[PDB]
Amino acid sequence: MEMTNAQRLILSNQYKMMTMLDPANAERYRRLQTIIERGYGLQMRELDREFGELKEETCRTIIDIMEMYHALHVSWSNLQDQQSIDERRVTFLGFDAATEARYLGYVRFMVNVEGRYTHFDAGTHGFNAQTPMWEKYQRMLNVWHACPRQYHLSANEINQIINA
Amino acid sequence: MEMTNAQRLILSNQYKMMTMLDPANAERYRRLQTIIERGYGLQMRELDREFGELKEETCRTIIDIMEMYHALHVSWSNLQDQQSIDERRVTFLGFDAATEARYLGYVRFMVNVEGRYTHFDAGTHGFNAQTPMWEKYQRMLNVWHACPRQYHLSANEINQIINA
Amino acid sequence: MEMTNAQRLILSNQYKMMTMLDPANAERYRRLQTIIERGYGLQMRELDREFGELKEETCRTIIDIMEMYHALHVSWSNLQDQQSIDERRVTFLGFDAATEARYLGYVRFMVNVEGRYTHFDAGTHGFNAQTPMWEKYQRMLNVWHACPRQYHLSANEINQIINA
Amino acid sequence: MEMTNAQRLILSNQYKMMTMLDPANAERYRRLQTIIERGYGLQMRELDREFGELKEETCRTIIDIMEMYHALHVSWSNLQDQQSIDERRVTFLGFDAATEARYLGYVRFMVNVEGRYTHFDAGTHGFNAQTPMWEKYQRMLNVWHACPRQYHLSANEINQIINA
Ligand SMILES: [Mg+2]
Ligand SMILES: [Mg+2]
Ligand SMILES: [Mg+2]
Ligand SMILES: [Mg+2]
Ligand SMILES: [Mg+2]
Ligand SMILES: [Mg+2]
Ligand SMILES: [Mg+2]
Ligand SMILES: [Mg+2]
């Protein structure tokens, strides 16, 4: 992680300030300060990986998937004849903790921190689907966005979407 | 937002420090810290939108409009015969809150914070003209700057300016 | 000022922290914060003006001029015969406050803060020569650096230098 | 130092904050602040030298040298007949304090701060070899990495490595 000298000075000063404000953790700060001041490249790389990225459009796709399930569930709940469509199929199961952790994390963030989609059933494992779901959701979105309405959907439309 | 990782580290450290200094708002800072650390692109873009821009020359134009009204009002008050020029026409009415908010904001900043043009009549709504004025003011400035003097204006000159 | 939005966020956070640490000056910090957040271009430019530049080589030239006077004064005081050479001529008078302020400021910094050349006679006005001296000093340096020794100068050499 | 003005403002604000937090050292900070604000180039360059660099791959090489000595020492201890093979030769002596200070410092950091290779014999001088070792270690690594096993080495292999 490079990282101009001027930035190193700024960071160095921060670790000094953090030591002043929070001496309980001086060890932690002096260590980082040393890494930054001396330009220990290995440890600097390792710092660099504390920082992730989840692209805007990916964030939006996740939110849209949740919105799709909102549209599906409401639509289902207003069907005269729930044409033997199981509620589970119209319920957002979330993402796989093992392979889709970034995505799962974002859902949890959107719900627990931001406060969105709070009336969703989290399931038994806080939206951990336990199977990969990303590819499925993409295909569902495609069918959903292709419908002439997205909300108040017919049983037919619901089935096309959930079976994508 | 196009942050480098070094900048993300700096910001992250700030939110930690702000939590130390102001624990009442730990929630607010922990959230921003998460957004920055994890690189949640959607949330980062929304961070970017909090920062506006009002170009130097636009700032100066606004100040100049106010200065023009100063020149106009002073000129008028020193007219031997105020040739039926209503004071209202020689009074800075400000900007439209609905479509010219940035401009209105700057006027208020220049007056209330900076302390300039304190003796101006703010009107009943703190310089909310309630109609767009920007285009009018530009035409007035053109006539005003074209006068061979800008101050101690003749009634004739005053009329040309206010009728631009 | 050409700030990126990330930098504006960093600065904004600093002004919030400075308000926490030093509430006596909340108004000053609050005002800067507004300027930065809203991107008020005029005020941002005026912010830029707070920051000067004095190039490395200019800094070094000033220090060297002082060192030259050290060499001159020691040389003079060690002379069996000071050939009617006035001590004043071998004394660093400093710089013109009115036209050479940057230079005068640096001398004062080097002496009062850094602690260098503290045995120099500051004169009655803290190294303010109150005539411009920069061009003279340049010519003196040229003669001085051209001398085969720079120290333990002969009366002859001293005269060539001070008369440059 | 190649600081932008925005960075200078950030740094200047830090030194203000550090003075608030730690007034005992106001002098230290006021001085740096002056250097930064006024752009005193000489002193600004001297700041830069406070920051060092030790490339990632060099950091890794040092760690690998230590790991090599771990592999060597364990292998030797497990030897049923140490065709002895003085233990001294299979012990990491460190780096020369006088010419390999950057390296020596990194070892000390990895051991004392990070907590790695804590069972290593530090010798009488905390890994100061007092002779240059860098070139030797490189040749040893070359032989070591060329062995089909890196660990559980034969006495033969140990000798090839230590004699590289
Ligand atoms: Mg790694
Ligand atoms: Mg949000
Ligand atoms: Mg938006
Ligand atoms: Mg203009
Ligand atoms: Mg101003
Ligand atoms: Mg110095
Ligand atoms: Mg030097
Ligand atoms: Mg490590």
Q: How was this structure determined?
A: X-ray
Answer yes or no: do B7 and C10 touch at CB < 8 A: yes
DSSP β-bridge partners for residue D54: A40
d(CA C145, CA C163): 14
Listed residues C35, C54, C73: the one ending a domain: C54
d(CA A135, CA A61): 12
d(CA A147, CA A144): 5
Listed residues D38, D54, D70: the one ending a domain: D54
d(CA C135, CA C128): 16
Q: What is the phi/psi pair of residue B110, to 5°?
A: -60, -35
Write out chain A residues lying below 8 Å of D10, CB-based.
10
User: Quick one: B117 and B89 in the same domain?
Assistant: yes
Q: Domain holding A47: CATH number? A: 1.10.287.680
Write out chain C residues lying below 8 Å of D43, CB-based.
59
Q: Give me ligand 5 centre to Cα B110, in Å.
A: 7
User: Quick one: C39 and C116 in the same domain?
Assistant: no
Closest alpha carbon to B147 in B79, B155, B136: B155
Closest alpha carbon to B133 in B81, B77, B82, B62: B62
Query: Does the beta carbon of B51 lie under 8 angstroms from any beta carbon of chain C?
Result: yes
**Number of structural domains, chain C?**
2
Whether the Cβ atoms of residue D164 and residue D142 lie closer than 8 Å to each other = yes
User: Quick one: B77 and B145 in the same domain?
Assistant: yes
Residue-range definition of the domain harbouring residue D14:
1-54
Query: Does the beta carbon of A8 lie under 8 angstroms from any beta carbon of chain D?
Result: yes
Answer yes or no: do B39 and A22 touch at CB < 8 A: no
User: Quick one: D120 and D139 in the same domain?
Assistant: yes
Closest alpha carbon to C65 in C121, C103, C119: C103
Query: Does the beta carbon of A6 lie under 8 angstroms from any beta carbon of chain B?
Result: no
User: Quick one: B81 and B19 in the same domain?
Assistant: no
User: Quick one: C47 and C60 in the same domain?
Assistant: no
Q: Domain holding C68: CATH number? A: 1.10.3190.10
Query: Does the beta carbon of C22 lie under 8 angstroms from any beta carbon of chain B?
Result: no
Answer yes or no: do B10 and A14 touch at CB < 8 A: yes
Whether the Cβ atoms of residue C71 and residue C49 lie closer than 8 Å to each other = no
State the nearest Cα–Cα gap between D132 and chain A, in angstroms.
21
User: Quick one: C71 and C4 in the same domain?
Assistant: no
User: Quick one: A34 and A59 in the same domain?
Assistant: no
User: Quick one: C70 and C17 in the same domain?
Assistant: no
* The two three-digit tokens of residue B34, written as one number: 């998460």
Nearest ligand to the CA atom of A59: 2
In angstroms, how far is the first alpha carbon of chain B from the final one? 43
Which of C59, C64, C114 to mutate to probe the D interface, most D CBs <10 Å? C59
Closest alpha carbon to D1 in D53, D29, D43: D43
Query: Does the beta carbon of A63 lie under 8 angstroms from any beta carbon of chain B?
Result: yes
Q: Give me ligand 6 centre to Cα D39, in Å.
A: 14
d(CA A61, CA A56): 9
d(CA C19, CA C16): 5
The resolution of the experimental structure, rounded to one decimal in Å, is 2.5
User: Quick one: B72 and B134 in the same domain?
Assistant: yes
Q: What is the phi/psi pair of residue D116, to 5°?
A: -95, 150
Answer yes or no: do C16 and B15 touch at CB < 8 A: no
User: Quick one: D2 and D48 in the same domain?
Assistant: yes
Query: Does the beta carbon of B49 lie under 8 angstroms from any beta carbon of chain C?
Result: no
d(CA B15, CA C4): 19
d(CA B119, CA B91): 11
d(CA B18, CA B35): 16
User: Quick one: D131 and D69 in the same domain?
Assistant: yes
